């Protein structure tokens, strides 16, 4: 839950998944 | 993400497109049979 925002940011930056 | 969002739209619209295209194709297909029947009736 804490890292959900960071994961969303990382998915937006890096990038049926 | 972009990958997660983009794939959903085309996948969702695929079934509707297939159904609409099938219905339309049947629509002009029945026209040929109706025309043949009309020629036979004449």
């Amino acid at each position: 839950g804490e890292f959900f925002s960071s994961a969303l940011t990382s998915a937006a930056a890096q990038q049926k998944l | 993400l972009a990958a997660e969002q983009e794939a959903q739209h085309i996948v969702a619209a695929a079934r509707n497109a297939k159904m609409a295209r099938l219905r339309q194709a049947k629509e002009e297909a029945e026209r040929e049979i109706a025309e043949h029947r009309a020629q036979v009736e004449r």
Partner: protein
Amino acid sequence: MVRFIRQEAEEKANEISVSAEEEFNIEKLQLVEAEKKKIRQEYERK
């Protein structure tokens, strides 16, 4: 990259839709050929 693979999967779904449309068009042609056949048979009987 990942968006490319997602678009590839979406295009695969769309291609399945298009193949279904083409198969349905062929099936409609066969069905109306059968309709012409039954119409010709019934008209010959009449």
